[PDB]
Each structure stands twice: as structure tokens, then as C-alpha cells.
Design an enzyme around this catalytic site. Sequence first.
Site, mmCIF file in Angstrom:
data_model
loop_
_atom_site.group_PDB
_atom_site.id
_atom_site.type_symbol
_atom_site.label_atom_id
_atom_site.label_comp_id
_atom_site.label_asym_id
_atom_site.label_seq_id
_atom_site.Cartn_x
_atom_site.Cartn_y
_atom_site.Cartn_z
ATOM 1 N N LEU A 1 0.720 -0.978 -0.279
ATOM 2 C CA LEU A 1 -0.101 -0.554 0.207
ATOM 3 C C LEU A 1 0.945 1.162 0.227
ATOM 4 O O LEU A 1 1.904 0.825 0.587
ATOM 5 C CB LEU A 1 -1.076 -0.240 1.354
ATOM 6 C CG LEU A 1 -2.163 -0.599 0.712
ATOM 7 C CD1 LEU A 1 -2.271 -2.337 0.775
ATOM 8 C CD2 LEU A 1 -2.961 -0.275 1.939
ATOM 9 N N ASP A 2 0.522 2.807 -0.390
ATOM 10 C CA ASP A 2 0.258 3.375 -0.564
ATOM 11 C C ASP A 2 1.639 4.180 0.534
ATOM 12 O O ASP A 2 0.464 4.095 1.676
ATOM 13 C CB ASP A 2 0.223 4.659 -1.859
ATOM 14 C CG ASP A 2 1.255 5.891 -1.805
ATOM 15 O OD1 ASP A 2 0.981 6.678 -0.866
ATOM 16 O OD2 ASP A 2 1.161 6.334 -2.581
#
Lengths: 84, 73, 109, 51, 50, 615, 69, 487
Positions: free
Chosen positions: A40-41
Site C-alpha cells: 500500500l502507498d
Amino acid sequence: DDHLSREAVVDRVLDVVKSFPKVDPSKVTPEVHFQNDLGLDSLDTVEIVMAIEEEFKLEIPDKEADKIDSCSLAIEYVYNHPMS
Amino acid sequence: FRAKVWSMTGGPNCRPKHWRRNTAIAMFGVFLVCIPIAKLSAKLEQRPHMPVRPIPSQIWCKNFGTKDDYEKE
Amino acid sequence: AAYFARRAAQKERVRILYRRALKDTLNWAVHRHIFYRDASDLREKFNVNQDVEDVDRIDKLIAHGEAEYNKWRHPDPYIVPWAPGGSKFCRNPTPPAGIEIVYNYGLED
Amino acid sequence: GITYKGVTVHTPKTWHTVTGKGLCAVMWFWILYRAKQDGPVVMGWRHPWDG
Amino acid sequence: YEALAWLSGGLGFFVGLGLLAVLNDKASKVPFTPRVYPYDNLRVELGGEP
Amino acid sequence: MYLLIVFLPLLGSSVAGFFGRFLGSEGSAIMTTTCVSFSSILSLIAFYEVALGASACYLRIAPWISSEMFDASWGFLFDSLTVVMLIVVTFISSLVHLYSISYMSEDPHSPRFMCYLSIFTFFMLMLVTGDNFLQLFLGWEGVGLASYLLIHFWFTRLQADKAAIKAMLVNRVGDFGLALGILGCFTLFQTVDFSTIFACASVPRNSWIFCNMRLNAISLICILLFIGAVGKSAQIGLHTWLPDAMEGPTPVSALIHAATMVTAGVFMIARCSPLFEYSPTALIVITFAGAMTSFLAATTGILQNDLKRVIAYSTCSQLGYMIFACGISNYSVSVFHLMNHAFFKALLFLSAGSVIHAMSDEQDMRKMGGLASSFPLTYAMMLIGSLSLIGFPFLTGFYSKDVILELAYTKYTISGNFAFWLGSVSVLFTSYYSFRLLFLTFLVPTNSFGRDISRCHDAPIPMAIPLILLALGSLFVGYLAKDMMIGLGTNFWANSLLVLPKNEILAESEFAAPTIIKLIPILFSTLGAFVAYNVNLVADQFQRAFQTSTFCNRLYSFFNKRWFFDQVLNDFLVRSFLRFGYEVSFEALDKGAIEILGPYGISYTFRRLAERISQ
Amino acid sequence: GGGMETNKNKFIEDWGSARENLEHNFRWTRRNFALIGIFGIALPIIVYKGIVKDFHMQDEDAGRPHRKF
Amino acid sequence: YFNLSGLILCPVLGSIILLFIPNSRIRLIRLIGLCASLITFLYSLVLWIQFDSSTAKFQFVESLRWLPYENINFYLGIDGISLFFVILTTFLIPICILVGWSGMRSYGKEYIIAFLICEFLMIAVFCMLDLLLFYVFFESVLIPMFIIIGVWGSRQRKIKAAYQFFLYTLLGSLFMLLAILLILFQTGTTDLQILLTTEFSERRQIFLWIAFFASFAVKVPMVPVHIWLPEAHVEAPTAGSVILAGILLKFGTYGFLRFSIPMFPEATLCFTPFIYTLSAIAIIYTSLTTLRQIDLKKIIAYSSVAHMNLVTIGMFSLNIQGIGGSILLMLSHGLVSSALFLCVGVLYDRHKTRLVRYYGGLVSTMPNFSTIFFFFTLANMSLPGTSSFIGEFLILVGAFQRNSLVATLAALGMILGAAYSLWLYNRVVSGNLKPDFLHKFSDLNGREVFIFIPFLVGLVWMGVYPKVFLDCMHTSVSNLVQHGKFH
Ligand SMILES: CCCCCCCCCCCCCCCCCC(=O)O[C@@H](COC(=O)CCCCCCCCCCCCCCC)COP(=O)(O)OCC[N+](C)(C)C
Ligand SMILES: CCCCCCCCCCCC(=O)SCCNC(=O)CCNC(=O)[C@H](O)C(C)(C)COP(=O)(O)O
């Protein structure tokens, strides 16, 4: 005032990241962190916190709000908090 | 620790077993002491005006229509 | 340098300010069908640079971001009623853990 | 009320809907009732009480 | 200290709009005449002498 | 019998407080409420035997201050004006008592609550039935004391403590004027009673010697009385308390914030009617202050996003309207709007509390969305109350707002026109934020959380009967009372309310209406409806959030922080007082300055003079 | 835990028994002179003049000549 | 034939019996001391029955020769004013015995000796018509209060507290003594009845008024001299500190009524604005000083200072109602301040902190003490329905009738009274409970619960029906106001 136990919290907490489209809902784990395992960012870290806040009425203080980088920390926290 | 303090006005959740019995006494207590207030007031409530229509307070009162003049107060 | 202490501070401030911006966006957007677009705009704004490496080009950016964010505050932000600042904080708090009350005080002999 | 994915709403009681409807209908009728009998009072046309 | 600057304007609107009600002089715009009563404007029933 | 009207709530409160351990949390609830309902029935009987059977009742218990020609007595004045407020206070107090037993079933300290409520009922009964300034002053101070106690119902709650303290100080500074007024009117009449000054209140025409310069006598007394009423009516001077007063329980707020203590300041003017009409100077400043407060509150309430906070500003706007009504010698619309208000804002307060405590104790506009179909009863109730609040044509609130605005237009004085303009432009604001309340809740997608909706429970039956009674009232009472008490010379008031021949403009307030101004506030109401619906339901993409550069965020802050009154007043008066009470009085007056005569001031002086004397 | 008395925290003891004796601090400084000359000699004189002026104006209205006082 | 001689003899017999009682018999000492005090209280009460509130002259008088030529002699008596002070003095002392009842073993019999000595001492002050001997007993109370403050003081800093309370009193005492000598040498005697009927010189009037004001401005706390009361009053035992504000504070203020107002009719009028400009600024400055205070005892003392400065305004405002209101306010203050110091001393006898910082959330426990404290704070809060409001309303009425400016400043006092007393109440017994400091604590037992019962009943009685107090002394106040002038 029922004070729901772990049985009803393992599903609701995990649904928050299950509904996240960036992470594939095929290998979501109760014990997983989105930094490396889920990919995930680094910006959407707090977005999951806001989403779970929209489910359980509780706001962690901002000092350790982002200290929860793993799904386990959030669910043990929301069980630890009494008013959730 | 709430049981230790007296809390004269009653504890937080003070629920006596015979609370109905006490409430009956308390309501009876108000009524019995309310009569002296009503009885002692009967010698009072001076209203020189005479209403256009009869009210129901003539039985226990007589201080109406009598204090007409104001030259012998 | 090779010191991540400075960058860990950056990765901390970015998350803190993003959380605060999302909170304020929720406050300003009383209705939510505008809150989706506003939240998308805020998220996209945080991805405008998304590539800072130099330490000289971050302090100015964080200062500008803080100054712009503090300019709109929604003077009445959302606080949970039992939260520290809410409408029922210390409503009926749990009594203190250990306290005892002595009974026979002021007696003699 | 039927349960959904988070909104397990409870339907209002029997007397918390029919009473509200049958009490609000009274006000709705009363608005027009006062707009018909005493309605001509404040409009600027046909002043009542011998007018 | 910046609040006092807004304080002056906030009350200034009230007094400013109060003065505007003097610039129109609605007192002389009455569509009727001052009310008059019998018996010297009800002198006996308002005081004076019988 | 007439003593039972006043003493029964006090007796119930005393016995409940003294024996709150003998009676459970429900025994006191069913006992004090029963006593208050008995008092309400007694008040209704008195209203039937006095208001219709026009014969006022007078009495005197005992001399309170039996000094020389300063006769203070425990007598009461059961007058035609007084009995209407007897009805208003007793009916609403009994309904609030029935309301609270459902709310307080979960709150632990239940019996203390009804004890406080009955103390308040007794105090305000003593006030309204009173006939002497000082004997009315005990009720005036007791209302504030009960207000403090009830807002301080939550001793743990830090915000409630500060709110209660600040409310007490501001109310004291307010009724300072009235307190000065009792002995101001005493130095001209050498008496304090009402019947002996209303008989001859126009004779004095001399001046005084005040602190700075000689001014008028009667006008100064009326000014002081109005300043006293400012503290208990949240006027322009001191209205810092009411917006922050809703930090305590809800059922009391329906009785202290919008129903009865509202009536104290206006009833000050109403009771002493043949004193203000002989002081035209005071009437004009009263009108200015009332209009200013009404407009200020009306534009204040629109930005706030809380159930109780916004409606407090609506209450303050009605306060301003009523103060103006009492400022133009048109006290009829003042008491008529008082009677209406005690219905259609108490009802709204009960509805707001019902929707608050049934939704996990949340009072917000930004977070809570729409749940109207979940429960139609109390929403129908609150819709009726709001329709009365805007004063939809041919409703209870219309028969007061329409006539008061027409009276404002008719009087051509420098204050009549200005205040009529202010009321006309405030109608738009009130109809805007009332419908904003109706729209941001129950008419939007639900923005709340998924747990609170599941834990939904409608209004219990015992708390719904007061709402039913108030809804039945504030739909027929306006029509029933329009003719009988504002009817161009109705003969039931007698000496209760006296209007001078000169300033009597009522018939030409109805037969000289241009018909282009009488029906205009309905036009502002519908325009406010349109703009509120457009902004808060459809056109909210830019009309809601304004992320401009400057002058627009500060516009948001200016009205959210209510003109920075809580900032400028605090820092420039109380912060300075607290600073100079430690760095002036405790530095250069007693401790440090003249302490050169106590320890270390003369003690060391004699450690040198006495030393060099043995050698 | 059997002590009914307070713990008497060190940081509170100084705060308590420091304001009790402020003679050492409030001896000679510039602001003290201004404060004393503006609030112990200035205000009493102003209010005394106001009171005597009020008495004189009360006398004049009654017409009697003002007393020297 | 219950005359005034027995009222003074009974405490003397009580003290004399206690002198020759062994220290071991602690059971008997307290019993006999309390019995003597209660007999004195009843003997004072019975005087109110036979008061005969009709005559302008003085009540029961006892004359005992003091000089070979009967020039000046012990001449007892009450007229209408000192009667209530005698009653309240006789009533406060048994409360003093009862409050210091539990810890009498450490105190010993010397504790009751001082209290009974001061008891008949203050009894002999109020009913003393001879002017000089009024000064002898007026300063005789130095020794008992000195001993009470010093021997049984709470903290070790009591040494410096007593010195101020002593020397400040001695300075004014001797300044008054010089005036007494001037009056005696000029007139010839010091009997009050005669000395009120002597034509004085206007130039002499001002000097003698100033000389009396030298000390009478110390007993009532004035602006120049009020430092002694807080420093020498926070540092006294609760049983002893409750009469520094109880009867030791009413000497000078009452001394104005008996030896200044009718004595110097032409000087009080000339010095009226000075008293106004002192007291009006006192009620402001002391009240502001009260706000920024931390000790629990000092705030009550400062409130007492403000109340005395308020009553001084209504006393020098010569009105038939001003003086009566002054007496009512003084009696009410004697009740309420005494009650407040007992209320703040019962906390000290359990925790020994005297700091508002430690106290907090005392409503969740000891609720009876909280209710009593709230009632007495309301009484100090100046609410109608309590005896105080009857006290200061008449003060305001009397001041406004004479001067408009002084009444506004005086009422600023009762406006500002809601800033410190209510704040103290909400900061002591209505805050958040803290177990860090107040680990454990009890509530009021049967002793302090019964102590406040007479205070509460007297408070309510004189608040809702002050007729009897005003009825008993309307003649004396009328005689005092109308003096020297004949119009
Ligand atoms: C203007 C003055 C008029 C006369 C003054 C009396 C007016 C009423 C003043 C007192 C009102 C009650 C305030 C009491 C203190 C409030 C805080 C408190 O201490 O509460 C106590 C006291 O509770 C009370 O309120 C007792 C009220 C007794 C007062 C009843 C008398 C009022 C009517 C008398 C008025 C005079 C009548 C006329 C006389 C001729 C205990 O409450 P709890 O519910 O137990 O909560 C404590 C928490 N815990 C349980 C854990 C310990
Ligand atoms: C109404 C109030 C709304 C507030 C709006 C105004 C807010 C300020 C807007 C102006 C300033 C901005 O654009 S704020 C934009 C701030 N963005 C950054 O600093 C990027 C930092 N990038 C990195 O650290 C690394 O590339 C990496 C660890 C890979 C990325 O992961 P994270 O970055 O996750 O840590």
C-alpha cells in the site's frame, strides 16, 4: 453496553482493508501490515484509520494514531478501548 | 466505595426494597401537613372584588365583598 | 547523510497533516456527496510532488503546507462527545480506583 | 425493521407512527380551516365583520 | 488584538443602521393624525384636578 | 388554597431532598412530579376563577422587614397578569417533570434533579406571585441560583463548572441594575410595594444627583430596572451566559433556557407597566437594545452546528422581540408572544432532547444526517413546533409575530422604524436557520456511524405525553387567545397592565395596514426556505465550502465566535481584573508597599537603632 | 496507604509559602512606583473628589450653602 | 432579678473551678467548662426575655466604685445594641468549646481557661457605659487572644503572626487613651450619660474624632491598616480563630456606634466623605485581592474584611434604617463567618493542608459537609432569604438615601462577592476527585453536625423573620440617630 468480544471484531476490522481496492482481497490477513506484505502507498496509511473510525466511534490520539502500521495493532487497540 | 458515604439525599442508584411503602408515607406526610397551610390561609386571601360569576371558593372563604370602604383601615 | 531520522520526521508530518486535512475536509463538507470529491482533491494534492529527495526542498514545502492548512480551520471542528473536548467528557467518570472512608473518627478514649 | 450491512434499523412502534400521522393531519386540516373561515381576514380583500 | 477591530465594525453596523433610520424621518410620514380624547384629552381620568 | 399553589413544590422538594434515601430513584420521580401537577391543577383553578371571573386575589402573610415606613411583607399579588404566568410556569414545569423521569432513568443522581426542579418551580412561583420589589428580588436571585445548580448538575464536568460560574457572575452584573432599582424607586416614594406606587407613579417629576451629573429620576429608575432585566434576558449588554448554558442536562434546559427564566426579564417590565410608560427616555433605549439583541442572535444562530446551541440563539432572538414589544408600550404582544414561546420552544426543546438521547447522546449537525423515517412521532412534533416558530400563516406563532411586526411598523418614533427594519431583516435569518435545522437533520443522507443507527430506540411513552400536550396546545392556543386578550380593549386585565392614552396605537395597527407590509414576513420566510433548501440539499458544491484566500474564513470565524465577545470581553475585563488583583492590590497597596510597617519593614529598623545605643 | 494527611508535594510547598511573603520582591522598582501612584493616591483622591462634588450638588439643589468639610 | 452581675460572675466561677482541677481529670474539665459556658448562654438568653424594649435610657445597671471620689466607676448596662452582641458572644463560646472537644487531651485545661477568660472579658466590654473602663476591657482581650494564637497555633510561623496583631492594636489603643485623657481632663468624668451632654469645641471635636479613629480603624479592617487580620488570623487554632472574626472583629465597628457617633455629632458629618472614600475603595481592593489567593483560611478572612468595610458605610450613613441594618449585618456576619471558619477548619483537622490545590471533588464524598458548606457559602454569597441580605440591603438603602455615588461602589462589593466565594466552593468541593493527595477521609460525625445546627437555625430565623431583632432595638437606634440636633 454489550462490549463485543474478539469474535465480532475480527470481521469488522478486516472488512475495512478488504474493501480497499489497492490491496487485493485475496490474501488479506488478520495479522498483516500494508507497508510490505500488502503493498500500500505510504499516504493511504491514515485513510484506513479514518475508515475504521467511521465504523467504531473512537479517535486514537494523533501521537500514536499512525503508530499502527499493522492490522493487528488496530484491532487489539479497538478491543482495548472500552467506548468503541 | 459508594456504599461507605451516607449520601443523605440518597445514593446514586439508591433503591430501597420497600420504596413504595416509604412513598406512600411521604405522600401521606405531605397531605397531612398541607391541611394546616390550607386551614391557616382561610383567615387570609382578602379580595374586595366580587366576581361576575360565582367561584367555588365561597365555602371556605368569607373575605370578599366585605372590605369595601377604605376610610377605616 | 544516510540518516533516516530526518526523513522519518517527514514521513510522520505528512501522515499527521494528511489526517488533519481529512478531518477538516469532513468538517467543512457538512454533506458527504461533496466530501468525496474534496477528499479526492486533497489526496491528489498530496501526490503533486511525491518525489522529494533534497532536504533543502522539504522545509519550505512543510512550512507552506502548514501555513495554508492553518488558514482554514472550521472554528467548530468535530470532537467525540466523550473525547477530551466533547459534549459529555467526564459525564459520569469511573470512580477512583483506591480510596477508603473511615467511620469512627473524632471519638475519644 | 429489516437488517442490512450496518443499518439494522428498528421499525418504529405501532403508536409512534399512527399517532404522529393522525395528529399531524389535524394540523394540516386546521391550516386550511383557519384559511377559509378567518382566512378572508388578512388578505386585503373582503374585510370581514360587516365589511 | 485583531478581534477588537472586528468588534468596532460589528457594533458600527448597528449604530450605522440606527442613524439611517434618522435620515428618512418616518415621524413626519404618518398617514394619520395624533389621537385626541374628549374632556381635555381625558384630563379628569389621567390626573389634574376634578 | 392560594398558598397551596406556591408552597407545595417547595414542600415536595424539601421532603425529596431530605429523604432521597428513603425514596428510590422512582419514588421521588412520582412524588415531586405529582405535587407539581397538583400545583398546576391549582393554578388552572385560579385561572378559571380569576382570568374569567375577574376578581384579583390579595393577601399578606407576615412582615418581613418591619423597619420604619419600609414595610416588607410576605404577601402575594394573585392578579390577572400573574395568573397567566402561573399557568405558563406550572403547566410547563409539570410537563418537564414528566419529561425528565424517562431521561433520568439512566442518569444515577435522579432524585436530586427533581429536587432542584421543584426548588426552581417554588422560586419562580414566589417571583411571579410577588408584590414587593425586595420580595420579588428573592425570586429574582433564586431563579439564578437554581439555574446555576441545574447547569452545575454535573460536578465532574469541567465545562459545566466554568459555565455555571460565569453564568452566576454575568447574571449578578446584570441584575445589579434591578438591585439598584429597588432602592432607587424607594428614595422617591418611601415605599417598596407595588399597589402604593402604581396608584401614584406619575406625580414625581424632579431630578437627582448621580455619580457624574444630575439626570432624571423616573427615567433613571426605569433604566436601572431594564439593566437588571438584561442579565435575566440575555440582552446586548450581557448575553455571554445563555449560548454556553447548555452544558448540563436536557430536561432542565427545556425549562430554564427557553421556557420560564426567559420570562423573568420581560415580566419585570410587564409587572411594572405603570412605571416605564412615564419614562419615555427608557422606552427608546429599551427598544434599541431589544432590536439589537434580536438581530444579533438571529444572525448568530445560523452558523452554529449544534442542536441546543442554535436554538438558544433563537430563544435570544425571541427575547429581543419581546423586549421591543415591552419597549413600545405594546405589552399585549409581549405577553402573547411569551405565552406562545413557552409552548413552541419548550416543545422543540423536548423534541431535540428526545432525538439526542435516543441517538447515543449526540448533538451535532455536521455528523448526524437523516433518520426521519426511522421515527415519525417526534419529528412530526418538532415540525409543528418549527412551523409555529417561523409563524406560518394561521398558526400559533403567526398571531404573535405578525402583530408585533405590525406594531413595530406603526410607531413612527426613531426607535420604531429602526427596530421594525431590524425585525423584518431578522425574520429572514430566523426562517433561514430554522429550516437549516429542519434540513441538515432528517432530510439528508445519514452521515452518522454504523453502530448508533443499530442502537435505535424511539421516545418512550411517558416522555411523549408532554410532547402530545404541547403539540395540542401550540396549535389552538394562538387562535383561542388572539381575540380574548389582544382584541382592542379587552376587559380582563383591569389594573394588571396599564397603557397610557398617548402611546396607544392598536386599532390603526390593523385598520391602517397597507397590506404590502403585513404579509411580507411570510415572503422573507419563503425566500429563506428556498435559499436554505437550495444551499443545503442541491446547490452545495460551492455554496457550502468557501476555500477562498481571505475575508471569507474570517467571516466564518466572526459569527462562529459570536463577534469575539467571549474573547474581547474576557481579555479586556476579567483577565485584566484578575491580573490587577494580584499585581496591583497585592503589590502596591497592602502586601509589599505598606508592609514596610509590618514584618521586615520596621523589624530591621530596630536592629540598627537599638544596637548602637549600649555603646 | 494509611495516612489521612496529604502528601505535601515539594513543588507545591514553595508555591504556597512563597506568595505568603512578597516583601523582598516588592521593595523598589519602576513599575511599583507607577502602580502605587496611580492606584493608591490617584484613585482614592478621584473618588473622594467625586463624593464631595456629589454632596455639593445635592446641597445646591436644596439651596443650602455647601459645608466646608 | 437576673441582673448583669451574675452574667459576668458565672464565667469567673467556671474559670476559678477549672484552675484547681488536676490535669489527669480530663473527663471533668471539658464537662464543667461546657456546662459553665451553656449556663452563661442561658443567662444571656433570659435577659432578652426581660429586656423591656421601650425605654430610651439604659437597662439593668450595676455601679461599683473605682476612684476615691466616685469620679469614674464601673457602670454596667445595655440599651438596645450591645444586648444582641452579648447574646452572640455568649453563644459563640460554647461552639468554641465543642469544636475543640476531641483534641482536648493535648490542649489541657489551659485551653478552656483562656476561652472563659476572654468570654467574660468580651461580656464586660459590650455592657460597659463608663468610657475609660470600656478601654480597659477593650484592650484586656489582648492577652487571651495572644495566648490562643501563640500557644496553640497550627504552624511554627505563629511567632510573627501574633506580634502584628498585638502591636497594631497597642498603637491605636494608646492613641485612644490620649483622647480619653483629654476628655476626662476637660469634662471631669467619663460616665457615658453625662459625657454625651457636654458642649464640645469644633476644633477639639475633629482631633478627638481622629484620635478615636486611630484605633477603631484597626479593629474594623480599613485600607491603610488591614495586614494584621489575614497573617494573624490564618495562623490561629480553629476554635480560637473563629472568634477573631466572631467577637474580636466587632469591637471597633460597634465602638463607633457607642463612643463616636453620638459622642461627636458635628465631627462625623465633617468626616463623612473620608469614611466613604476609605470603605468604598476597601470593598473593591480587598475583594480583588481575594481572587488571587490559594490558602483556604485567608479567603474567608478577606471576605470578612469586605463585609466589615461594607457595614462601616452603612453605620456612618446616619439613618434610622442604616444603623439597624448595620447591626443586622454585623450579627449575620458573626454567624456566617464563624460557620465558614469551622467549615474550613474541619477539613484542616483531618488533612492539614490549607490549600485549595489539594482539595477537590469533595461532593463525591462527605456530602453532608458539602451541603453545609454550600449553604454557608450562599449565606456569604449574599442571597435574599438569608440573614445577610437583610444585612446589606439596609446598608445600601441608607447609603443611597444620603449619597448616590457610595451606594454603587458598595453594591459593587456584593457583585464581586460572587467571584471568589463561589469559585472557592466550586474549586474545593465540586472539582474532579484526585486520589493522589486525599487518599482517605471521613465525613462529619455527630459533633460538627450538631455544631452547625444552631448556626443554620439562627441564620434562617434572622433571614426570613428579622422582625424581633429590629423590634427589640428601634428605640435605641432612633435615640442614637437623633442626637445634638433638634430638627
Ligand atoms: C437563596 C437561599 C435559600 C436557602 C438555601 C437553601 C436552598 C437550597 C440550597 C441547597 C440545594 C441543594 C444543594 C446541595 C449541595 C449540592 C451538591 C451536593 O453536595 O450534593 C449532596 C447533597 O444533596 C442535596 O442536594 C441535598 C439537598 C438538601 C436541600 C433541601 C432543602 C432545600 C429547600 C430548603 C429551602 C428553604 C425553605 C424555606 C424555609 C422557611 C449529595 O448529593 P448526591 O446525589 O448524593 O451526589 C453525591 C455523590 N455521591 C453520592 C457519590 C456522594
Ligand atoms: C482545508 C485544509 C486542507 C489543507 C490543504 C493544504 C495542505 C497543504 C497543501 C500544500 C502543501 C502540500 O501539497 S503537502 C504534500 C507533502 N508531500 C510530501 O512531502 C511527499 C513526501 N514524500 C516522501 O517522503 C517519499 O517520496 C515517500 C516516502 C516515498 C512518500 O511517502 P509519504 O509521503 O507518504 O511519506
